[PDB]
Amino acid sequence: VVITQSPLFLPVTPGEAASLSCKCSHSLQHSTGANYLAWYLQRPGQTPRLLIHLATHRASGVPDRFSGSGSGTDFTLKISRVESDDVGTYYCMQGLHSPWTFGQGTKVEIVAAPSVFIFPPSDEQLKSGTASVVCLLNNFYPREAKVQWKVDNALQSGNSQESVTEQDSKDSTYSLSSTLTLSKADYEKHKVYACEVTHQGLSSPVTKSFNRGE
Amino acid sequence: QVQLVQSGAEVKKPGSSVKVSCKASGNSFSNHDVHWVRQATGQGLEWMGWMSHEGDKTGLAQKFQGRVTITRDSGASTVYMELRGLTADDTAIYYCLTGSKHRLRDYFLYNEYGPNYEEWGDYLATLDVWGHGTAVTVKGPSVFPLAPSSKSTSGGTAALGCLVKDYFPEPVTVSWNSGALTSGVHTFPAVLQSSGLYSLSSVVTVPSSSLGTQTYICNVNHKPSNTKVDKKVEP
Amino acid sequence: TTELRDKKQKVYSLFYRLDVVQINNKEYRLINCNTSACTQACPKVSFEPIPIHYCAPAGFAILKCKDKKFNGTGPCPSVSTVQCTHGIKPVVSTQLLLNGSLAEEEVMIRSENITNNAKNILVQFNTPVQINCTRPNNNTRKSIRIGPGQAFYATGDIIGDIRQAHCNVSKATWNETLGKVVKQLRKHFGNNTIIRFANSSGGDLEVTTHSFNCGGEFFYCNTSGLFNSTWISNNDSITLPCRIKQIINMWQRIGQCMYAPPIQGVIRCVSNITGLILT
Amino acid sequence: TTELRDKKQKVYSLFYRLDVVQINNKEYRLINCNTSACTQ
Amino acid sequence: TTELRDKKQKVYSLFYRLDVVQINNKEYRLINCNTSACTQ
């Protein structure tokens, strides 16, 4: 018994309609005629909220812009006039076949090149035998960005990690930080430290660099 | 509006077992089915198991077959979920919750020589009330300044931050100027390093103008190690 | 359940509230099920009373007095004998006797002991008193196949003149005959006594109301409309409200029951009150 | 149904198509059951 | 199963071990049921 939700990721223009698919390898219709499929919205930081039960019924207090349909194997959740409160992950859940199971979810969200900033390691950190260099990509959209660290123009790999924020509710952007970590010894053998950045908003890659010392 | 209360967060070694408990206001597990659902950070919902409020049915997901016990005290006053043989994969928030069922009769054949032959079957209807969850997780941070410089400044705005390096376990909280500075703050989710320790950074964009006059202090709190750090970030 | 021993079938039917009782829409129960099992009377067999003659075997004689007078016991000046008895219809009823024989001369009063109040008093009429009873319900019979094989006749729909079943009695006739009865009573109680008539003491519905046969259907009538009078010291017509019941107990034989199948079409039996059963 | 008045068992048997009739693999019925009971 | 031919009822009773036999608390059987129907 398998469930496939589609699409995996759905950007929606505010006020436009959204359509989510949940398909099952086996029928979810009981012989009494009811379809045991449900839809749940989970917003960031929250427990899931029931939207639709028995395939077609809105749950209590669910706004009428959410509507469910489908019978058998194929089910749809339509959201008309999408707004920021509708952002999150939508899970379907089949209740016919034991063991019961959630789908893997559809992520729903609502060009800006990043501003790029670079930070050398602190004197205090160096004292302790490690050097972390930090690159910040600020306020960009869409979410896809690539950071490539260079040391004296040599490409680095396996010595950095990155983290991205959630979408800012006010400007609809993301921010990302990448941290390159080296030993003090490796760090002091080189001069130019550079963060090279690729994004849909940039016509060609942007490099932020500094020279060790000054 | 039943309220569910769950037991507190726990840290467990790989290979051990956790027993999570749950109570419902008004002893509602007597009259409403209990479900267990877990969710790892950034991942989907995973149904674990349930018990009917009648106390005549229990079931588990395939993945928890042999791993999980779901039980309740008499009078259904407390419900428990025990997961054994923990690994890092079991690091998640564990939710207790309720739901309805439609015990419909599938197979049936009337008999004209006494009682009939019935075969009821429970079918999940909805998932009503979710508990707040129990975080099961299967060193205090160093705090270093990310100093504002000409390499973090443009168009009248500067960026500055704090690097919160090498702590365990989650969580850590960061504020700026004791909560007085919130506009333009980005505190990034932690990353798990090869060493098994976490790191994160918090940055803020501020007017370049203000660097000479305004003080910036990041406040870092790591309750697990009782570590509280206030770090001033200078140009 | 139907013939297909596997799946049931949701059906419906009508039942009098005299037949069913609330358990504990609402839940109800067939009243008989707390006492015994119940059997459906065949739709082919009838209940029409047929004149039966009784005969004695050789060596025994059927003696028959022709004396128009008779106290219930004693010598008869005029005795005859017959091969067999006259045809007597087995009319099962209570209180009011129906389709019996008529008395000659005056109204006859017979009792095992008139002085004792515990005994009953039999009253035989001289002239047939017509009674005409009606059930104005052109109802159908939604028979349901509750096999395997055997069939049940449920109650379909009730249409037509939705009025309560009732009986019509010639009032002046009743008054006249009743008077003739009182004359007799006068003759065994005195020429200065008062005679009053009233309904039964209630209790069981079978002894309270008037039970009688009428084309398979069982009627229970409130004879208060008849037995309500009085006499001193020395159209018009009457309507009697009746009730219908499908489950009844004959001869008061507890431990058993019998379900009479409904009858399609309007029913209108006719009988003649020939005697009474006073106490 | 068997003697064990609690659990049933699936069995099989052969029947001539003169004895059985299609209802409505496929479903079939013993022809007698529409007319009366049958005795062995 | 009581008179209410629909819902069963849990009861209890005592029986001599000469009357009953183990099937296969434990499960037991009225000895007569393997031979014939017992009439009271």
XYZ file of C-alpha atoms in Angstrom, chain B residues 3-226:
224
model
C -5.971 18.805 26.554
C -3.205 16.199 26.332
C -0.194 16.346 28.651
C 3.001 14.507 27.635
C 6.104 13.531 29.616
C 9.216 15.737 29.387
C 12.042 15.753 26.835
C 14.590 12.963 27.161
C 18.107 12.219 25.971
C 18.907 8.540 25.476
C 21.998 6.582 24.453
C 21.931 4.588 21.191
C 20.814 1.064 22.118
C 18.567 2.014 25.039
C 14.800 2.484 25.308
C 12.358 5.325 26.021
C 8.916 5.105 27.593
C 6.796 8.180 26.795
C 3.563 8.857 28.695
C 0.448 10.842 27.983
C -2.597 11.947 29.977
C -5.828 13.463 28.686
C -8.001 15.917 30.612
C -11.224 14.355 31.916
C -9.714 10.909 31.426
C -10.611 11.127 27.728
C -8.550 8.102 26.602
C -11.443 6.063 28.040
C -13.693 7.369 25.264
C -11.354 8.427 22.456
C -8.756 6.302 20.602
C -5.033 7.138 21.253
C -2.532 7.472 18.387
C 1.217 7.950 18.365
C 2.871 9.911 15.595
C 6.520 10.951 15.385
C 8.356 13.503 13.285
C 12.100 14.095 12.918
C 13.338 17.648 12.360
C 12.600 18.722 8.771
C 10.927 15.406 7.908
C 7.409 14.049 7.398
C 4.774 12.681 9.767
C 5.150 9.059 10.659
C 2.264 7.107 12.168
C 3.523 4.758 14.895
C 0.547 2.923 16.390
C -2.756 3.265 18.200
C -5.078 1.742 20.756
C -8.878 1.760 20.609
C -10.541 3.520 23.575
C -12.461 0.244 24.107
C -8.997 -1.291 24.885
C -9.751 -4.274 22.534
C -7.438 -3.249 19.625
C -3.826 -2.169 19.244
C -1.806 -1.817 16.018
C 1.662 -0.624 14.956
C 3.397 0.487 11.765
C 5.480 -2.199 9.995
C 8.699 -0.343 10.991
C 7.858 -0.612 14.726
C 6.937 -4.273 14.700
C 9.036 -5.756 17.526
C 10.252 -2.254 18.582
C 7.234 -0.602 20.191
C 4.763 -1.348 23.084
C 1.647 0.749 23.517
C -0.090 0.269 26.857
C -2.376 2.053 29.312
C -3.027 1.900 33.082
C -6.410 0.680 34.350
C -9.256 3.160 33.842
C -7.129 4.421 30.913
C -5.719 7.208 33.091
C -2.284 7.271 31.416
C -1.146 5.981 28.033
C 2.425 4.879 27.287
C 4.587 4.233 24.265
C 7.854 2.360 24.670
C 10.402 2.332 21.877
C 13.482 0.130 22.247
C 16.835 -0.251 20.425
C 17.152 3.501 19.810
C 19.466 4.884 17.124
C 20.066 8.427 15.870
C 17.225 7.708 13.397
C 14.814 7.710 16.329
C 15.699 11.280 17.284
C 12.354 13.007 16.841
C 9.388 14.652 18.527
C 6.927 11.982 19.681
C 3.270 13.015 19.639
C 0.342 11.608 21.504
C -3.053 12.263 19.941
C -6.640 11.096 19.558
C -8.976 10.250 16.715
C -12.294 8.720 15.742
C -13.011 5.376 14.098
C -15.881 3.834 12.129
C -16.081 0.188 13.236
C -17.855 -1.072 10.126
C -18.882 -4.686 9.555
C -17.204 -6.167 6.475
C -17.817 -9.923 6.374
C -21.149 -11.296 7.573
C -23.305 -14.346 6.876
C -26.673 -14.863 8.540
C -27.291 -18.191 10.235
C -30.747 -19.739 10.628
C -29.864 -21.990 13.559
C -28.826 -19.496 16.210
C -26.542 -16.454 16.358
C -24.854 -15.079 13.260
C -21.152 -14.791 12.368
C -19.857 -11.219 12.575
C -16.413 -9.809 11.817
C -16.030 -6.154 12.789
C -13.107 -4.029 11.653
C -11.889 -0.672 12.941
C -11.133 2.037 10.377
C -9.464 5.329 11.256
C -11.660 8.384 10.668
C -9.773 11.491 11.824
C -6.957 12.713 14.066
C -8.435 15.194 16.537
C -6.248 16.552 19.329
C -2.449 16.624 19.133
C -0.295 16.788 22.265
C 2.637 19.236 22.381
C 5.014 16.324 21.860
C 7.991 14.830 23.632
C 11.427 15.509 22.184
C 13.598 12.411 22.309
C 17.264 12.972 21.444
C 19.287 9.830 20.768
C 29.107 20.662 25.911
C 28.431 24.419 26.043
C 29.176 26.439 22.910
C 32.072 28.745 22.282
C 30.769 32.106 21.108
C 32.888 34.106 18.661
C 32.103 37.526 17.180
C 31.432 37.962 13.485
C 32.860 41.475 13.393
C 31.367 44.143 11.096
C 33.967 45.384 8.603
C 34.175 46.979 5.154
C 33.674 43.388 3.918
C 30.269 43.252 5.637
C 29.072 46.769 4.774
C 27.396 48.405 1.759
C 24.675 50.967 0.948
C 24.473 52.326 4.494
C 24.033 48.872 6.067
C 26.432 46.599 7.914
C 26.156 42.930 8.917
C 27.504 41.524 12.156
C 26.869 38.351 14.087
C 27.892 35.653 16.520
C 29.205 32.207 15.708
C 27.964 29.664 18.239
C 30.412 26.803 17.820
C 30.626 23.226 19.139
C 27.751 22.489 21.488
C 25.745 19.401 22.345
C 22.903 18.626 22.380
C 20.262 20.884 20.804
C 18.689 23.328 21.566
C 20.366 26.733 21.762
C 18.630 30.134 21.824
C 20.023 33.474 20.647
C 18.801 37.027 21.221
C 20.341 40.453 20.532
C 20.564 43.238 23.122
C 18.344 41.247 25.509
C 15.507 41.018 22.969
C 15.549 44.752 22.171
C 16.925 44.072 18.670
C 14.757 41.885 16.434
C 14.522 43.666 13.085
C 16.974 42.227 10.518
C 18.075 39.311 12.734
C 18.638 35.936 11.122
C 19.418 33.103 13.483
C 20.241 30.047 11.375
C 19.298 26.426 12.125
C 22.166 24.447 13.636
C 24.306 22.139 11.534
C 25.600 18.830 12.875
C 29.361 18.533 12.389
C 31.464 15.363 11.856
C 32.605 15.528 15.488
C 28.962 15.041 16.572
C 28.757 18.637 17.827
C 26.436 21.368 16.584
C 27.139 24.880 15.327
C 25.027 27.822 14.287
C 25.377 31.487 13.521
C 23.154 34.472 14.192
C 23.578 37.622 12.079
C 21.952 41.024 11.990
C 21.991 43.897 9.526
C 22.149 47.348 11.096
C 22.702 50.894 9.821
C 26.436 51.521 9.198
C 25.822 54.876 10.952
C 25.202 53.155 14.258
C 28.473 51.236 14.526
C 30.207 54.094 16.338
C 27.441 54.577 18.937
C 25.192 51.513 19.341
C 26.387 48.514 21.348
C 25.642 45.029 19.979
C 25.606 42.047 22.289
C 24.413 38.588 21.381
C 22.927 36.577 24.226
C 23.439 32.825 23.932
C 21.622 30.305 26.127
C 22.416 26.571 26.183
C 20.263 25.177 29.010
C 21.546 21.554 28.734
C 24.985 22.717 29.954
C 23.681 25.700 31.983
